[PDB]
Design a protein around this ligand. Structure first.
Ligand SMILES: CCc1ccccc1-c1ccc(CNCCc2nc3cc(OC)ccc3[nH]2)cc1Cl
Ligand SMILES: CCc1ccccc1-c1ccc(CNCCc2nc3cc(OC)ccc3[nH]2)cc1Cl
Lengths: 320, 326
């Protein structure tokens, strides 16, 4: 395959000392979890359990994410990235790194977030929160980090305080030009074309594809927008909207070899117009600006997608 | 008999934990294969250990291998359990592996590598800021291990490794460490002569984390005054006389009376009568650049006969002497 690199923040890690991006060499100081009393379980992840807790030293609520130590290297990676991004705009704030004295199970302690469930959402609300996610993305990309798991589940919102946080940095990675990354990242519905066609030299632009999937689901009230039933089928769902002509132009541009599992399922599909997804229940959220912005996000060619900084200057945000 | 005493902080941390945490005799040690490590050079030798720099042949990383002379099996289980409990704590030496050589079957502990700077030459280059910085780093380790219900019981310069280039500090050699249980009567034959707290010297067995705070105080005094060691006893009885020559014999009697301690008759002919000295007395041309009212106030609050009056590690971290450190 043809090599590729990010159009923005290409060498931000290259120009930084190894201590910034060498997470394997990072020394983790595990404090005592006795300073936190667990209150209740909030939810479960594939390798984590999140709890609401109280910091007994200052009577403040916190969130404790207890990690199943399946891969030690991955825990070091998440901790290093969270430490590097700590305090960045709309990034979940790592407050402490602790282990229970008896269990010795790794646990991450974060700032509390009064997560609203979610209906009454306005056109302005979508622009507002989309801009808030872009602030987090332009910040983490500028810090040489790809989130690689952008989806609604990883965005916490406190609608009362108009506060948004990008969470779960467990799949995040440092961007190095020319690096070949594992494509088994992100959640099925939000996997970029690059992951599905097994193109390993991807970049921050993957997060922009995921953001586009979120936008399409909201404005069209179709969740998920690209509803694959497996990783191969996911690419077919994309092809049913974007067309198969541009998919071949993409794979040809990067000299990608298509897995033979696509042979019997891909078929032939026309490129659809975004206006076709507009209906009576969603028309109050759709506008020419929204469709133009969406069109500039959902592109097979990762290099042609808007960057988070370019996306922030789009007319769709002129009102925020 | 003597008046009972308990720690002012972290009193019941082990009492409220399941026996698995502190019953080291029942702990099952999994001894791995030492073939993954090649010994490079000897770093130093302890009374019952030899510490080597080694290379982990599976990942080409340097490690530290402590080969223990298995004189007391229970003590090895204790050290292993404590190191396992504290594994990953701030400024605590990190146990990486537990191994036995296939032929020798000698117990060996494998730790994270530490680039130990020789301070015998950099003792002269240290600044007031450096002493406050490294003292704060030791207090992080102590407040952490105490919070984990562990007393180190051998706090001294030899058991503190510093990589000055990276401003990295590690509290090592947990061979004498013990689990704190309120009301437990401990062996007083712990720590190293110069660093022994008065509780040990007067054979008061019901001591606690505060013992480590006296030892830290001896280290602070030897550094800021450039007097190594600060309390230079020639035997364990004489060590108390050297402390009394500074702290005075009036406060020593107030201490033993408070806990109804019986003073060993071996003290009769050597203790004498001594005035309480002012800390400013130890200031001289060679060390004045390391001394300040804050430093002497902090030292005065560590070096107290009464173990209960000494600052805890958490109280010590909030002292004005540390206002200048992160
Ligand atoms: C209105 C903004 C918006 C624009 C476009 C597309 C979607 C959305 C959106 C819609 C809903 C949500 C809320 N997602 C909830 C996130 C969440 N995981 C959690 C995990 C937990 O424990 C594991 C607990 C609470 C959690 N809470 C976030 C977002 Cl960003
Ligand atoms: C400025 C730091 C400081 C502030 C206040 C009082 C003392 C000190 C201090 C001064 C020097 C040192 C360094 N000690 C190194 C100890 C050490 N064990 C070793 C064991 C070895 O084999 C078993 C080999 C080398 C070793 N090397 C530590 C400390 Cl904590």
């Amino acid at each position: 395959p043809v090599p590729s690199r990010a159009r923005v923040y290409t060498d931000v890690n290259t120009h930084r000392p190894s201590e910034y991006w060498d997470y394997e060499s990072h020394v983790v100081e595990w404090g005592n979890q006795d300073d936190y009393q667990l209150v209740r379980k909030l939810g479960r992840g594939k390798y984590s359990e999140v709890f609401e807790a109280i910091n007994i030293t200052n009577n403040e609520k916190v969130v404790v994410k207890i990690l199943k130590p399946v891969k030690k290297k991955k825990i070091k990676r998440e901790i290093k990235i969270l430490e590097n991004l700590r305090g960045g705009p709309n990034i979940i704030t790592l407050a402490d790194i602790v282990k229970d004295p008896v269990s010795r199970t790794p646990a991450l302690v974060f700032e509390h977030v009064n997560n609203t469930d979610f209906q009454t959402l306005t056109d302005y609300d979508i622009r507002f929160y989309m801009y808030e996610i872009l602030k987090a993305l332009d910040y983490c990309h500028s810090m040489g980090i790809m989130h690689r798991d952008v989806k609604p589940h990883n965005v916490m919102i406190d609608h009362e305080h108009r506060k948004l946080r990008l969470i779960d940095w467990g799949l995040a990675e440092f961007y190095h030009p020319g690096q070949e990354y594992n494509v088994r990242v992100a959640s099925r519905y939000f996997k970029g074309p690059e992951l599905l066609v097994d193109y390993q030299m991807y970049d921050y632009s993957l997060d922009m594809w995921s953001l586009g999937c979120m936008l399409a689901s909201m404005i069209f009230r179709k969740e998920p927008f690209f509803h694959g039933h497996d990783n191969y089928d996911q690419l077919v769902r994309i092809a049913k909207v974007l067309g198969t002509e541009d998919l071949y132009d993409y794979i040809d541009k990067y000299n990608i070899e298509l897995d033979p599992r696509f042979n019997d399922i891909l078929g032939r599909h026309s490129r659809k117009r975004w206006e076709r997804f507009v209906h009576s229940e969603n028309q109050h959220l759709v506008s020419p600006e929204a469709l133009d912005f969406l069109d500039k996000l959902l592109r097979y060619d990762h290099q042609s997608r808007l960057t988070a900084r370019e996306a922030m200057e789009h007319p769709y945000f002129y009102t925020v």
